[PDB]
Design a protein around this ligand. Sequence first.
Ligand SMILES: O=C1NC(=O)c2c1c1c3ccc(O)cc3[nH]c1c1c2c2ccc(O)cc2n1C1O[C@H](CO)[C@@H](O)[C@H](O)[C@H]1O
Length: 565
Amino acid sequence: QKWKWWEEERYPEGIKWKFLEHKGPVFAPPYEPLPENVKFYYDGKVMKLSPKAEEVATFFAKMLDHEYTTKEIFRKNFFKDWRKEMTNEEKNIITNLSKCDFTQMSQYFKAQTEARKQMSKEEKLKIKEENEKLLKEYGFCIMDNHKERIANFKIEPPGLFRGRGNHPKMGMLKRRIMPEDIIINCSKDAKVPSPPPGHKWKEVRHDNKVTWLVSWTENIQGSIKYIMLNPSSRIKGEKDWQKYETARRLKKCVDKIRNQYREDWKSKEMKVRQRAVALYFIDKLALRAGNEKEEGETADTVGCCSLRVEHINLHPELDGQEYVVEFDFLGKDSIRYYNKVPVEKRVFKNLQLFMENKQPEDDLFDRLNTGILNKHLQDLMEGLTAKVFRTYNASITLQQQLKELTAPDENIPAKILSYNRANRAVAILCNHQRAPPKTFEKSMMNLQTKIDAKKEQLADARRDLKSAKADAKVMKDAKTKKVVESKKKAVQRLEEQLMKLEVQATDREENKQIALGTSKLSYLDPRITVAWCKKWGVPIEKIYNKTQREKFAWAIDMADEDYEF
DNA sequence: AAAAAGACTT
DNA sequence: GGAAAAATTTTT
DNA sequence: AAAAATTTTTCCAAGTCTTTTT
Ligand SMILES: O=C1NC(=O)c2c1c1c3ccc(O)cc3[nH]c1c1c2c2ccc(O)cc2n1C1O[C@H](CO)[C@@H](O)[C@H](O)[C@H]1O
C-alpha cells in the first residue's frame, strides 16, 4: 500500500502521537558458559571462575588481539570493575590483572568465530529464518493508525567501554540491562507489554510529549539510552524535513547575517566582539558550536565556543598569503581539524585581544558559550541554532557544485562521478576526515589491473577496426561496409566500459581520506539529489541505496526536476 | 540564571 | 555513521 | 571448489539543544 505521511496535515506542536503499542524490547542473549576444556589460569595454576567474573573475563579475552588492552586506563578501569564482580574467595587470590592468563579463552573465541564461517547451508538458513521472525514480532510498533518500523529493538549486550580517543572511563564494564532498568512508553488504550517471566519493568509511562518507546540509564556516563523509530517513520521524517526547511529559512537572510557579524568585529563591547568571530568560524570554516563538557568524564575534545588558547596559533605571512590562522585541535569523536586559513584584517587583530594576558590552558572565548551564542541566533531568526549553519553551508554547496560538475553530454556513470565529486566537496568542508583502511588500500593494484586489462581488449578492438578499413581498399561492397559498422560499434562499447572503470577508480583514490556518509544522510537536503536525478534522467536507485531510499521517501515522491534549495 | 536532566541529532 | 563483521559475490 | 574483493547488517558513542530541577 505505502503510506504517504508527507501529504497529511502537519502534527500540532506539543503532541507527538495519540496511540502507541509495542511488544517492548528484546534482551541481549544470555551468557553461554566456557566448556570444561577451556581454562583460565592465574599465577600458572588453574582457576575455575564464577559465572559473574568469568563473564567479564570473556569480555577482556575477546579484545586480547587489540592494542588498547595494554593501556594503563583500560587495564586500571577494567580490573576495578572486575574485582567487584568477583566472589569473596576470588577477591582474595586475584590481586592483579597482569598475573592472569586469558590465552586459552582468547584462542577458543578465535576458534568459534572460525567455526561459524564453516557452518553448513542448512544451519545458516535456520538462524536467518528465526532472526526474521524476531524482526516481525518485536521489530515494528503501532503509532497512530499505521505500522512503523523500530530502530534498535535489541538492547546492547554487556561488554567493555572504549569509546573514542583518550577516554577516562575506557575499560569499564557496561552492566547488563535487566527489565527492572527499563522504562516503557505506550498509550493508555494500548496493550502494555509483558516483561520476561518473573520480572517487572521499572516504570510504565504514557508520555505523548516524547518520541521514544523504551528508555533506560547506562552505567558508564549515566546518560539515557533510547529505542526510537526507524528513519522511514513519520516522527523521524517530519522532523528531518523541518530541519532542511529551516536551512532554507536561513538562506533568504544568510547574507544579511554574514554582513552583520562583519560590522560587529568593529563593535564597542568585548562580548559582542567575541560572539561575532565565533559565528565566522562556524559559518565559513565549519566548526561545531562547542558545548562545555565535564572534565574527567569524557575525552578532551573541543569545538568553537569551547576552543582554548593552545588550540590556535597566529602567523602573519605563511607561504605567500597575509593573516594566517593555524588550527590544531581534536573535534567531535577525536577527529583532528588542521587548517591554515587567510582571514580578514579585523579578525587576526581581534584574536590577539582574546589571547592577551591568558595562559594556554584557558578558554579563548570567555564571556561566551553555546547558550549565549544561541540566544543571539534566536533574535536573528526564529528557530535558528548553531547547527543550521552546517546544514545550510552543506546543502547549498552541494547544489552549487552539481550545477558545475554535470555536463549535459556525459553518459550515466560519468554523471554519478560528478555527484560523488560534489558530495566529496561537502565532506572536506564539514570535516568528515577518515584514516585509510589497514592494508585494504593495496587492492588498488587489483582495481588498476582491471583497467589495464580493458586496455588489452581495446588494443585488439582498435586493431580490428584497422582490418575493416584496410579491407575496404581491396573489394568495396555491402559485405565489407558492414565490417566498418560492426567493428566500430564494438570499439565504442568497450571504450565506454574503460571510461566507467576509470570513473569509478578516481572515486576511490580521492575519497580515501574522507567520508560522504554523514553529510549524505544528515546535512544534504535529499530533494537536491532527487531534482538532480530527475533532471539528468539518472535513476535514484544508483545514488540512494535500500535504506536511504526509505528514509528519504518524502523527497523521492514530492520533488520535481525544478527544486531549488 | 546555572547546574543537572532528558530528548533527539550526527 | 564510521569501523568491524557477517552474508554475498567476483576472482581464482 | 577455495582464496579473495565487494556489499550490507550489527557494533559502539559523542555531540547539539531543549527542558527540568536546584
Ligand atoms: O555517527 C555516529 N557515531 C556513533 O557512534 C553513532 C552514530 C549514529 C548516527 C549518525 C547519523 C544518523 O543519522 C543516525 C545515527 N545513529 C548513530 C548511532 C551511533 C551509535 C553508537 C553507539 C551505540 O550504541 C548506538 C548508536 N547509534 C544509533 O542512533 C540512535 C542512538 O540513540 C538510535 O536510533 C540507535 O542506537 C542507533 O541507530
